Amino acid sequence: HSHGKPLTEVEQKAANGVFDDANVQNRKLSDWDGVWQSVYPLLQSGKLDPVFQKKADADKTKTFAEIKDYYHKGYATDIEMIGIEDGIVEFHRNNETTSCKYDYDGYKILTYKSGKKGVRYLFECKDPESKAPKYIQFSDHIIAPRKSSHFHIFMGNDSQQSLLNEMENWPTYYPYQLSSEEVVEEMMSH
């Protein structure tokens, strides 16, 4: 070190933050079906350090430590695991789990300060008996139907716009079955 059909040119550009708004498409929650591990505990045990070292050695300005701090802020979350199936997202803290059958509310295209772009896929929990986040957004470098390989998820109870504003913290999830070594390889290979 690819996980289904290779990417087309539009898809590859899209993954690199280059795309036309007209090529963005709606997605179903099932693109994120599966069980997923938070990568934060891997950061916190030093097991992602090889990733930060490769990134440092390839950037002229940033040190290993600056890069590691960037991902520390980015990955931080107490949601250790996320399960998605049958329209339901389940959030695991410790031995506490919450869940909701989320309603899709479309997407939002963002342009970052760098000029690169990304798409958030928006969902809302309207179950009054749920203790899960009212608003969630998926971001995973994909702009049209395709099974996700890993994702960044924004979670909150205030508004969708509050989450659209969040640029520094993006809890990150890889397939649960991967070993720490396999997560590291994935991070170095895409």
Can you give the binding site for a second copy, defined by CB under 8 A? 3-4, 33-35, 81, 83, 85-86, 92, 95, 97, 175-177, 179, 181-182
For residue 156, the partner it binds in a second copy, Zn ion, none, with Cβ less than 5 to 8 A by kind, is none
**After what residues is the chain interrupted, C–N > 2.5 A?**
1
Residue 72 neighbours by CB distance under 10 Å: 14
Residue 126 neighbours by CB distance under 10 Å: 10
| CA nearest to 184, candidates 58, 15, 55 | 55
Looking at residues 74 to 113 of the shown chain, list those that interact with Zn ion (rule: CB under 5 A): 83, 86, 90, 92
Binding mask of the shown chain, residues 152 to 181, with x at each position contacting Zn ion by CB under 5 A:
------------------------------
Binding residues: 141, 150, 152, 186, 190
Task: Give whichever of 107 and 186 is closer to a second copy, judged by the CB atom.
Answer: 186
Binding residues for Zn(2+): 141, 150, 152, 186, 190
Task: Give whichever of 35 and 164 is closer to a second copy, judged by the CB atom.
Answer: 35
**Distance between CA 80 and CA 99 in Å, rounded?**
14
- C-alpha torsion angle, residues 145, 148, 154, 156 (rounded to 10): 80
**Distance between CA 148 and CA 155 in Å, rounded?**
18
Task: Give whichever of 9 and 96 is closer to Zn ion, judged by the CB atom.
Answer: 96
| CA nearest to 166, candidates 100, 130, 112 | 112
Instruction: Tell the smallest beta-carbon distance from residue 149 to a second copy (Å).
Output: 8
For residue 1, the partner it binds in Zn ion, a second copy, none, with Cβ less than 5 to 8 A by kind, is Zn ion
Looking at residues 5 to 24 of the shown chain, list those that interact with Zn ion (rule: CB under 5 A): none
**Distance between CA 154 and CA 133 in Å, rounded?**
10
Binding residues vs Zn ion (CB under 5 A): 1, 83, 86, 90, 92, 186, 189
